[PDB]
């Protein structure tokens, strides 16, 4: 299962920030949902671990 490769796959699919209003996956450092459908809010939450 190779935990370094697990770190790589979790880097590509786990540690993202999810916006509470637009529900889009963004980036681990991002502050704002880039979508027009909510309008660039600063309302986020981290993506849930197992």
């Amino acid at each position: 299962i190779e935990p370094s490769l697990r770190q790589l796959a979790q880097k590509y699919n786990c540690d993202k920030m999810i916006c509470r209003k637009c529900y889009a996956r963004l980036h681990p450092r991002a502050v704002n949902c880039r979508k027009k459908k909510c309008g660039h809010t600063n309302n986020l939450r981290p993506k849930k671990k197992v």
Binding site: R6, N13, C14, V50
Partner: peptide, 10 residues
């Protein structure tokens, strides 16, 4: 789930 099933070519 894509937190489990971590499969692909990255």
């Amino acid at each position: 789930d894509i937190r489990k099933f971590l499969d692909g070519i990255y």
